[PDB]
Amino acid sequence: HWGYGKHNGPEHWHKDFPIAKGERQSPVDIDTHTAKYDPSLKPLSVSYDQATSLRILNNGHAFNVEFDDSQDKAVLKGGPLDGTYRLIQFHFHWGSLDGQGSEHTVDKKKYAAELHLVHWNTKYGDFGKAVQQPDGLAVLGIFLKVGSAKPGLQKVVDVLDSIKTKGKSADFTNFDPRGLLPESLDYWTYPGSLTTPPLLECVTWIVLKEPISVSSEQVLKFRKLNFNGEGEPEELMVDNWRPAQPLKNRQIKASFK
Numbered sequence: 001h002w003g004y005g006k007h008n009g010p011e012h013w014h015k016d017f018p019i020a021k022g023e024r025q026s027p028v029d030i031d032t033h034t035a036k037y038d039p040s041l042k043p044l045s046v047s048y049d050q051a052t053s054l055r056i057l058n059n060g061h062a063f064n065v066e067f068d069d070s071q072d073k074a075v076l077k078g079g080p081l082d083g084t085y086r087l088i089q090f091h092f093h094w095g096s097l098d099g100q101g102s103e104h105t106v107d108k109k110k111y112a113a114e115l116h117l118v119h120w121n122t123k124y125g126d127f128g129k130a131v132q133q134p135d136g137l138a139v140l141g142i143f144l145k146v147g148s149a150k151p152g153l154q155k156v157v158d159v160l161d162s163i164k165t166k167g168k169s170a171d172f173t174n175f176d177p178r179g180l181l182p183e184s185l186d187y188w189t190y191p192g193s194l195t196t197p198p199l200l201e202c203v204t205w206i207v208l209k210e211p212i213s214v215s216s217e218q219v220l221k222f223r224k225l226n227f228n229g230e231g232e233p234e235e236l237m238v239d240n241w242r243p244a245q246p247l248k249n250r251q252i253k254a255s256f257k
């Protein structure tokens with residue numbers, strides 16, 4: 001199936017998923033000097049105090065930390081959003097080297113990694129229904145640069161040994177995603193898509209201006225994971241990012257000057 005190798009990577013996705021070449025695909029390059037400051041953009045509301053993490057899973061493309069989304073416990077509101085969006089899962093994209101790994105780019109700059117906190121619009125009842133709507137998902141994207149260690153990330157790093165191969169999962173309760181946020185909630189926003197197949201065009205992207213710093217030792221542990229399942233030949237899980245797609249008929253708004 002689809003992946004990030006020479007023969008099944010993003011260049012090939014359009015064959016099974018023709019929407020790959022569609023009107024609002026993600027990620028994109030964020031040209032900071034073309035983004036329009038929009039003073040009518042309300043502040044982002046991130047309410048994660050009652051967040052309930054359940055499990056961590058290696059799905060063969062990345063690892064997902066999954067949350068109980070059966071109630072309004074961890075939600076995104078405000079900013080460009082109408083209504084309430086519940087946190088369902090977060091995961092990362094990263095590189096084989098510190099100089100690549102992010103999906104979005106800022107003035108063509110690639111970051112070492114990118115975090116995606118995925119939320120769905122409660123008005124649609126469940127994640128599966130939400131992805132069929134143009135405003136079904138809100139994804140908060142955070143860049144990672146390599147520098148000082150992120151303490152709130154270490155609990156994630158430590159459990160990776162236990163989910164090394166595709167299909168492995170582990171218990172992962174009492175994790176607080178607030179430890180993954182930068183100081184500022186200043187952001188860019190644009191209409192886009194899932195960055196993995198089926199690449200559905202259902203996402204309001206909210207990309208934070210300020211990256212978080214993680215240590216080289218922390219990202220190094222991401223790179224020890226495997227794309228392959230247990231017993232299969234070993235392919236390191238690295239460079240699991242889709243490159244920037246054409247902006248086309250879209251505008252990027254900024255919450256700040």
Ligand SMILES: COC(=O)/C=C/C(=O)N[C@@H](Cc1ccc(O)c(Cl)c1)C(=O)O
Binds near residue numbers: 128131196
């Ligand atoms: C930007 O974030 C994303 O691209 C998030 C992608 C994502 O959450 N994908 C799912 C799989 C999935 C399951 C049911 C469905 O109807 C579809 Cl369309 C996908 C996953 O990784 O578990």
Ligand SMILES: [Zn+2]
Binds near residue numbers: 092
């Ligand atoms: Zn992602």
